[PDB]
Amino acid sequence: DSSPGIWQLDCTHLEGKVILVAVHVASGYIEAEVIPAETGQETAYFLLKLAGRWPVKTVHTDNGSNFTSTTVKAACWWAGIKQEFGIPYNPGVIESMNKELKKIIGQVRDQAEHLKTAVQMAVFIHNKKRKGGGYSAGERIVDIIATD
Ligand SMILES: O=C(O)c1sccc1-n1cccc1
Ligand SMILES: O=C(O)c1sccc1-n1cccc1
């Protein structure tokens, strides 16, 4: 829950659509997108995209069955990603950040036609505008990774 290579991926639902949320656990930085279907294929695609942008070493999820997809495992394999086992399940920080992201989405929803755009507005607010040495999550992730 503190190595700089750990990301957590989960799905949540809004307006009948699926939002995939990835959290960089050490910093609190978020990546999220609306995806057309809650599937292993979309999970795998997202992992490939994420790993090309950030150094992804291990991945966790609050729904372990997500990672039983052979397409997910192939994306893993190709990108050199392993599964994270040092984070126990809380039947939660990451769950709460997901709930906070949904709150931000609601606050900006009427400023965009499509949910996908509101989600990106909320990610921007979460990573860049929120501050909590009073840096943003975007500042924290780059500092953590650069130091590593
Ligand atoms: O998409 C699939 O066909 C399979 S099969 C085993 C797990 C998954 N999955 C679905 C959502 C996230 C992962
Ligand atoms: O208003 C919209 O629905 C779209 S669609 C693509 C970008 C935007 N947007 C949102 C804020 C500023 C621009």
UniProtKB/TrEMBL annotation:
The lineage of its organism: Viruses, Riboviria, Pararnavirae, Artverviricota, Revtraviricetes. Its cofactor is Mg(2+). GO terms for molecular function: aspartic-type endopeptidase activity; DNA binding; DNA-directed DNA polymerase activity; endonuclease activity; exoribonuclease H activity; lipid binding; RNA stem-loop binding; RNA-directed DNA polymerase activity. It is a lipid-anchor. It is found in: Host cell membrane; Host cytoplasm; Host nucleus; Virion. This is Gag-Pol polyprotein. GO terms for cellular component: host cell; host cell cytoplasm; host cell nucleus; host cell plasma membrane; viral nucleocapsid. It catalyses: 3'-end directed exonucleolytic cleavage of viral RNA-DNA hybrid; Endohydrolysis of RNA in RNA/DNA hybrids. Three different cleavage modes: 1. sequence-specific internal cleavage of RNA. Human immunodeficiency virus type 1 and Moloney murine leukemia virus enzymes prefer to cleave the RNA strand one nucleotide away from the RNA-DNA junction. 2. RNA 5'-end directed cleavage 13-19 nucleotides from the RNA end. 3. DNA 3'-end directed cleavage 15-20 nucleotides away from the primer terminus. Keywords: Aspartyl protease, Capsid protein, DNA integration, DNA recombination, DNA-binding, DNA-directed DNA polymerase, Endonuclease, Eukaryotic host gene expression shutoff by virus, Eukaryotic host translation shutoff by virus, Host cell membrane, Host cytoplasm, Host gene expression shutoff by virus, Host membrane, Host nucleus, Host-virus interaction, Hydrolase, Lipid-binding, Lipoprotein, Magnesium, Membrane, Metal-binding, Multifunctional enzyme, Myristate, Nuclease, Nucleotidyltransferase, Phosphoprotein, Protease, Repeat, RNA-binding, RNA-directed DNA polymerase, Transferase, Viral genome integration, Viral nucleoprotein, Viral penetration into host nucleus, Viral release from host cell, Virion, Virion maturation, Virus entry into host cell, Zinc, Zinc-finger.
